[PDB]
Amino acid sequence: GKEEEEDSTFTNISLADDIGSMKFVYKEEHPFEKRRSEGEKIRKKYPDRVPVIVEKAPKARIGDLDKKKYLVPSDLTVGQFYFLIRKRIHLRAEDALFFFVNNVIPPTSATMGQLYQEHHEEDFFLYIAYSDE
Protein backbone atom coordinates (compact mmCIF):
# COMPACT_ATOMS: atom_id res chain seq x y z
CA GLY A 1 0.00 0.00 0.00
CA LYS A 2 0.93 3.66 -0.36
CA GLU A 3 1.20 4.05 3.42
CA GLU A 4 3.89 1.34 3.32
CA GLU A 5 5.98 3.46 0.94
CA GLU A 6 8.46 6.19 1.81
CA ASP A 7 8.84 9.21 -0.47
CA SER A 8 9.44 12.03 2.07
CA THR A 9 12.71 11.19 3.86
CA PHE A 10 15.89 10.34 1.98
CA THR A 11 17.09 6.76 2.35
CA ASN A 12 20.87 6.58 2.34
CA ILE A 13 22.16 3.62 0.35
CA SER A 14 25.82 2.72 -0.13
CA LEU A 15 28.24 -0.19 -0.19
CA ALA A 16 27.84 -0.26 3.60
CA ASP A 17 24.55 -2.00 2.82
CA ASP A 18 26.30 -4.87 0.97
CA ILE A 19 27.14 -7.63 3.45
CA GLY A 20 29.80 -8.75 0.98
CA SER A 21 31.64 -5.53 1.99
CA MET A 22 32.01 -6.79 5.59
CA LYS A 23 35.55 -7.06 6.90
CA PHE A 24 36.11 -8.94 10.14
CA VAL A 25 38.47 -7.10 12.48
CA TYR A 26 39.52 -10.40 14.05
CA LYS A 27 41.26 -11.36 10.77
CA GLU A 28 43.09 -8.01 10.65
CA GLU A 29 44.36 -7.91 14.25
CA HIS A 30 45.31 -11.58 14.74
CA PRO A 31 47.87 -13.20 12.41
CA PHE A 32 46.76 -16.22 10.41
CA GLU A 33 49.21 -18.65 12.00
CA LYS A 34 48.07 -17.76 15.53
CA ARG A 35 44.40 -18.09 14.55
CA ARG A 36 45.06 -21.39 12.76
CA SER A 37 47.05 -22.85 15.65
CA GLU A 38 44.34 -21.93 18.15
CA GLY A 39 41.48 -23.20 16.00
CA GLU A 40 43.26 -26.45 15.20
CA LYS A 41 43.95 -27.13 18.88
CA ILE A 42 40.43 -26.28 20.07
CA ARG A 43 38.85 -28.54 17.43
CA LYS A 44 41.14 -31.41 18.42
CA LYS A 45 40.35 -30.89 22.10
CA TYR A 46 36.56 -30.48 21.72
CA PRO A 47 35.42 -32.22 18.51
CA ASP A 48 31.78 -31.67 19.55
CA ARG A 49 32.17 -27.88 19.65
CA VAL A 50 32.96 -25.31 16.97
CA PRO A 51 34.88 -22.03 17.33
CA VAL A 52 33.02 -19.02 15.96
CA ILE A 53 33.88 -15.34 15.52
CA VAL A 54 30.82 -13.06 15.57
CA GLU A 55 30.99 -9.41 14.48
CA LYS A 56 28.35 -6.79 13.62
CA ALA A 57 27.66 -6.02 9.95
CA PRO A 58 28.62 -2.59 8.51
CA LYS A 59 25.17 -0.98 8.27
CA ALA A 60 23.70 -2.38 11.49
CA ARG A 61 22.44 0.03 14.16
CA ILE A 62 21.68 -2.59 16.86
CA GLY A 63 23.69 -3.47 19.95
CA ASP A 64 27.31 -4.58 20.18
CA LEU A 65 28.67 -7.88 21.47
CA ASP A 66 30.98 -7.69 24.48
CA LYS A 67 32.73 -10.91 23.37
CA LYS A 68 33.45 -11.93 19.80
CA LYS A 69 35.07 -15.39 20.17
CA TYR A 70 32.72 -18.26 21.02
CA LEU A 71 32.83 -22.03 21.43
CA VAL A 72 29.46 -23.46 20.41
CA PRO A 73 28.07 -27.04 20.58
CA SER A 74 27.95 -28.57 17.12
CA ASP A 75 24.33 -29.60 17.75
CA LEU A 76 23.11 -26.04 18.46
CA THR A 77 20.69 -24.91 15.77
CA VAL A 78 20.90 -21.67 13.81
CA GLY A 79 17.62 -20.58 15.40
CA GLN A 80 19.01 -21.22 18.88
CA PHE A 81 22.19 -19.30 18.04
CA TYR A 82 20.08 -16.38 16.81
CA PHE A 83 18.21 -16.42 20.11
CA LEU A 84 21.38 -16.57 22.21
CA ILE A 85 23.09 -13.74 20.31
CA ARG A 86 19.88 -11.70 20.43
CA LYS A 87 19.93 -11.90 24.21
CA ARG A 88 23.59 -10.89 24.39
CA ILE A 89 22.98 -7.74 22.30
CA HIS A 90 19.69 -6.94 24.09
CA LEU A 91 17.70 -6.80 20.85
CA ARG A 92 13.98 -6.69 21.59
CA ALA A 93 12.04 -9.69 20.34
CA GLU A 94 9.96 -7.58 17.93
CA ASP A 95 12.99 -6.59 15.81
CA ALA A 96 14.54 -8.85 13.18
CA LEU A 97 18.09 -10.23 13.30
CA PHE A 98 20.04 -11.72 10.40
CA PHE A 99 23.19 -13.83 10.22
CA PHE A 100 25.50 -14.03 7.25
CA VAL A 101 28.24 -16.58 6.62
CA ASN A 102 30.28 -16.23 3.44
CA ASN A 103 27.68 -13.63 2.31
CA VAL A 104 24.71 -16.02 2.56
CA ILE A 105 22.08 -16.43 5.24
CA PRO A 106 22.41 -19.87 6.86
CA PRO A 107 19.86 -22.53 5.93
CA THR A 108 17.00 -22.61 8.44
CA SER A 109 17.54 -26.23 9.50
CA ALA A 110 21.33 -25.98 9.81
CA THR A 111 23.12 -26.77 13.03
CA MET A 112 26.24 -24.86 13.97
CA GLY A 113 28.27 -27.99 13.23
CA GLN A 114 26.81 -28.23 9.73
CA LEU A 115 27.54 -24.53 9.14
CA TYR A 116 31.07 -25.05 10.41
CA GLN A 117 31.73 -28.03 8.15
CA GLU A 118 30.60 -26.13 5.05
CA HIS A 119 31.96 -22.68 5.81
CA HIS A 120 34.89 -22.72 8.25
CA GLU A 121 38.01 -20.91 7.05
CA GLU A 122 41.54 -22.29 6.82
CA ASP A 123 42.24 -20.98 10.34
CA PHE A 124 39.55 -23.42 11.61
CA PHE A 125 37.19 -20.60 12.64
CA LEU A 126 33.66 -19.98 11.41
CA TYR A 127 32.95 -16.26 10.81
CA ILE A 128 29.38 -14.98 11.32
CA ALA A 129 28.19 -11.42 10.72
CA TYR A 130 24.98 -10.21 12.34
CA SER A 131 22.78 -7.38 11.14
CA ASP A 132 19.44 -5.66 11.49
CA GLU A 133 16.94 -5.60 8.65
Residue numbers in the entry: -20 to 112
Provide passages from the article that reported this PDB entry.
The SCOC LIR:GABARAP complex structure revealed a large surface of interactions between SCOC residues 6 to 19 and GABARAP. The SCOC core LIR motif displayed the canonical LIR interactions comprising the hydrophobic residues F14SCOC (Θ0) and I17SCOC (Γ3) deeply bound to HP1 and HP2, and three hydrogen bonds formed between the main chains of the SCOC LIR residues T15SCOC (X1) and I17SCOC (Γ3) and the main chains of the GABARAP residues K48GAB and L50GAB. On top of these canonical LIR interactions additional specific contacts were observed between the SCOC core LIR motif as well as the adjacent N- and C-terminal regions and GABARAP. In the region N-terminal to the SCOC core LIR motif we observed: a salt bridge between K6SCOC (X−8) and E8GAB, two hydrogen bonds between the backbone of E10SCOC (X−4) and the mainchain of D45/K47GAB, one hydrogen bond between the sidechain of D11SCOC (X−3) and the imidazole ring of H9GAB, and another hydrogen bond between the carbonyl of S12SCOC (X−2) and K48GAB sidechain. Within the core LIR motif, N16SCOC in position X2 was hydrogen bonded with the guanidinium of R28GAB. In the C-terminal region, hydrophobic interactions were observed between L19SCOC in position X5 and the edge of HP2 (L55/L63GAB). In summary, SCOC LIR domain binding to GABARAP is stabilized not only by core LIR residues but also by multiple interactions involving residues of the N- and C-terminal regions flanking the LIR motif, which range from residues in position X−8 to X+5. In line with the GST pull down experiments, biolayer-interferometry (BLI) affinity measurements showed that the SCOC LIR binds strongest to GABARAP (3.6 µM) and GABARAPL1 (2.3 µM), followed by LC3C (8.7 µM) and LC3A (27.8 µM), and weakest to GABARAPL2 (44.4 µM), and LC3B (270 µM). Removal of the N-terminal sequence (except for T13SCOC) resulted in a profound decrease (more than 140-fold) in ATG8 binding to the SCOC LIR motif (aa 13–25).
Autophagy-related 8 (ATG8) proteins play a central role in autophagosome formation and selective delivery of cytoplasmic cargo to lysosomes by recruiting autophagy adaptors and receptors. The LC3-interacting region (LIR) docking site (LDS) of ATG8 proteins binds to LIR motifs present in autophagy adaptors and receptors. A genome wide siRNA screen identified the short coiled-coil protein (SCOC) as a novel positive regulator of starvation induced autophagy. To further understand the role of SCOC in autophagy, we identified a functional LIR motif in the unstructured region N-terminal of the coiled-coil domain of SCOC.
